[model samples]
Target: TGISRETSSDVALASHILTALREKQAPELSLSSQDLELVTKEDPKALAVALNWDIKKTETVQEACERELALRLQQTQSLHSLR
Candidate 1:
């Protein structure tokens, strides 16, 4: 089935996480597929098998997204401190 209203937030969160991650690395790297997989609850093993990517690479991508999400939440919380 296609993405529905209920799952749109997952897609948006994944998109923002991917954007934050890519900004921390080389801009040329692509993660469009990874975004979908992230929302779908897929793991590195699944990504590796499906996309021919190394498990380690996908692991790093997953870790980076997690780290980015945490940092972004902190940043958002601190926004009230700004003028």
Candidate 2:
């Protein structure tokens, strides 16, 4: 999580996952703190699912992550312009 490390809720897991990915530098995330094992071997479906995105099966994690950022940024800027 962005603060605590004692909880094991999915909300906490998802928050940590999103924050780590949103960093300018890429992250090597662990699925669980039990091993702190890097999950860089594959585009984790867990992340995509937690993000509430309908990620295409063919897209890599990097692609999906950037795609979502670009989309949301565009939406934000569009709303700003509408004012």
Candidate 3:
């Protein structure tokens, strides 16, 4: 038989998973708490799903995180452009 898997719902755990994925996929991008906050504003659960993050397992979502990070960076850059 195979081992059963469970998921985690802890915020910090999710955050860490997101952070690592960001670093690997977008090392050039500067991610801040503010950036993450903006993401949550758009979709409160986006970070968790985007990172495929399990608070307990610390799973990573390389592709999804990259997509989300790129989107957020574009938004930020556009906002600055407008200013």
Candidate 4:
């Protein structure tokens, strides 16, 4: 579990995706459970889609991670800045 607080819903969502990766697997990450809780609450549908945990689990953890990372990177250039 990890958490991040942002100024907007969009930014928060982005942070959520980033947190999923950095918190769960990155060697150096700073997201907290609160951040994840916010995202899950703010956008349960989007979170489900991003995490690929809907529809009987059509997405694997690795797949979700890769997809989220790719999407996050595509939307922003500083995804790796947290390192």
Candidate 5:
């Protein structure tokens, strides 16, 4: 009747993805709820609804993360070249 261990695991995977985006360097990001409805797409939708957020906002966050990662890659490459 509640979130089964398997579904909870899926939800956990989603959180980890967000964490990777947030921390990018090595660790960190963030998450949602689903003692039930679990890790399905419903969980992410509910999470945004709870926060009163639009999908665009999430997209913006994603774009920002991508920018950061790209910058990190460039910086690392330049650093390696310096040596």
Candidate 6:
């Protein structure tokens, strides 16, 4: 099968993995506390304040982070899974 639909449980597991990634990457983060908080709370204001960045750059930065995370996730997929 190709590009199969993901189940809610897989997504749930992925979220746990995301949190693990957040903590693992905490040391490299500029504002670890605020970064973790923003990841959990997802507040736009918090994002702006923590990064001290403009709203326009936020989406761009987010896209990069999302791509990086997606890459990491795929790497993990090979190490994890029922198969």
lDDT of 3 by residue, 5-81 (tens): 23433234344444554334232244445444454353425544544546332223333544666676676453445
Clashes of 1: 0
* Ten contiguous residues with the weakest lDDT in model 2: 28-37
Error in Å for residue 57 of model 1: 1.3
In candidate 4, what are the lDDT values of residues 1-83, reduced to their tens digit? 25545553545445455546323532111333444345435443454455445533423444454455446547656566575
The residue-level lDDT of candidate 6 at 22 comes to 31
Candidate that scores best on lDDT? 1
Model 2: how far is 7 from its true place, Å?
A: 18
Give the residue spans of candidate 1 off by over 4 A. Answer: 1-40, 78-83
Model 5 misplaced stretches (Cα beyond 4 Å): 1-52, 79-83
State candidate 6's TM-score.
0.39
Clashing pairs in 4: 2-32, 2-33, 3-32, 3-33, 3-35, 4-35
lDDT of 2 by residue, 44-78 (tens): 47544444445553235456444554455465453
TM-score of each: 0.42, 0.28, 0.24, 0.28, 0.35, 0.39
The lDDT per prediction is 0.47, 0.43, 0.43, 0.44, 0.39, 0.43
Please give the range of 10 consecutive residues that has the lowest summed lDDT in model 5.
25-34
The segments of candidate 3 whose C-alpha lies over 4 angstroms from its true place after superposition are: 1-29, 32-34, 40-44, 56-83
- Local accuracy of candidate 5 as per-residue lDDT tens digits, 1-83: 32223434334434434344333312111223332223234333544443345567644544454455446547545444553
Candidate 1 differs from the real structure by a C-alpha RMSD in angstroms, to one decimal, of: 8.8
lDDT score, candidate 5, position 57: 65
